[PDB]
Ligand binder design. Structure first.
Ligand SMILES: CO[C@H]1C[C@@H]2CC[C@@H](C)[C@@](O)(O2)C(=O)C(=O)N2CCCC[C@H]2C(=O)O[C@H]([C@H](C)C[C@@H]2CC[C@@H](O)[C@H](OC)C2)CC(=O)[C@H](C)/C=C(\C)[C@@H](O)[C@@H](OC)C(=O)[C@H](C)C[C@H](C)/C=C/C=C/C=C/1C
Lengths: 132, 95
């Protein structure tokens, strides 16, 4: 009841990591990684994540432990916020991303889980990444 | 070693189904385009290359299909996430 909200924290303190600085994707680092390098365009990336609506309603809980979630970076396989956000991460890093609908699912949403014009919160741990 | 046709059909169908489901919110369309692919795996006389495919991915594809049947009976959307996890895993192995 009187505790920190991770979602409010990224909304009110997160750095804007869009190139335009349009507030579309905001980032807070929870745990600093060890890596020198960040993942590059076309890399295969492995993560744990979970996702919540900005109102607190969870929409993804089952990918945060155990088998990694894999995707190819910078390809439009995933929402724009992740292509921007994950590209800033180092190996071992955990961050929170707050994603405006223009960098997520827009006015169409992805119902039933994602309503139209939804701002999304993710926690992501970058596990590892590969060139090939 | 593994059937080129089965590999190409699942790659194409899984890609279509994902666009129907994630792109168009078309669950019925998703089930329809994958249904004859599952029925292929199940039905009799099989070659050596298709037997090999079925050995590599058949359990996961069967389980993915069962989660879809569960979804139909219950309406539990988590049954679809379970199915897509398995479909994606197979999609990645064959790409
Ligand atoms: C069971 O768990 C689901 C993930 C769920 C779905 C529902 C959403 C709420 C969510 O809960 O994830 C979620 O938290 C979320 O918002 N995600 C997933 C994690 C990355 C960020 C975001 C996302 O972009 O999802 C993605 C979002 C829902 C759809 C895409 C958003 C961007 C847009 O440009 C794409 O247009 C094409 C569509 C889902 C994915 O990350 C998967 C991997 C990618 C796709 C389906 C498409 O790229 C597809 O395009 C043909 C492909 O090329 C893939 C490889 C083809 C194979 C057969 C399909 C694999 C399906 C995997 C599904 C998985 C693991």
């Amino acid at each position: 009841n009187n505790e920190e909200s991770p979602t409010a924290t990224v909304a009110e303190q997160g750095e804007d990591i869009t190139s335009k600085k349009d507030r579309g994707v905001l980032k807070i680092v929870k745990r600093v990684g060890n890596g020198e390098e960040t993942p590059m365009i076309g890399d295969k990336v492995y993560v744990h994540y979970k996702g919540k609506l900005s109102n607190g309603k969870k929409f993804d809980s089952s990918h945060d432990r155990n088998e990694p979630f894999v995707f190819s970076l910078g390809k439009g396989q995933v929402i724009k916020a992740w292509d921007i956000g994950v590209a800033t991460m180092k190996k071992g890093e955990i961050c929170h991303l707050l994603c405006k609908p223009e960098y997520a699912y827009g006015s169409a949403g992805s119902l039933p889980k994602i309503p139209s014009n939804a701002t999304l919160f993710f926690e992501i741990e970058l596990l590892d990444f590969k060139g090939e | 070693a593994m059937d080129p046709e089965f590999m190409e059909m699942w790659h194409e169908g899984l890609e279509e189904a994902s666009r129907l489901y994630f792109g168009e919110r078309n669950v019925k369309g998703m089930f329809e385009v994958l249904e004859p692919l599952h029925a292929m795996m199940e039905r009799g006389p099989q070659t050596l290359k298709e037997t090999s495919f079925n050995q590599a991915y058949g359990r996961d594809l069967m389980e993915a299909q069962e989660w879809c049947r569960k979804y139909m009976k219950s309406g539990n959307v988590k049954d679809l996430t379970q199915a897509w996890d398995l479909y994606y895993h197979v999609f990645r192995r064959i790409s």
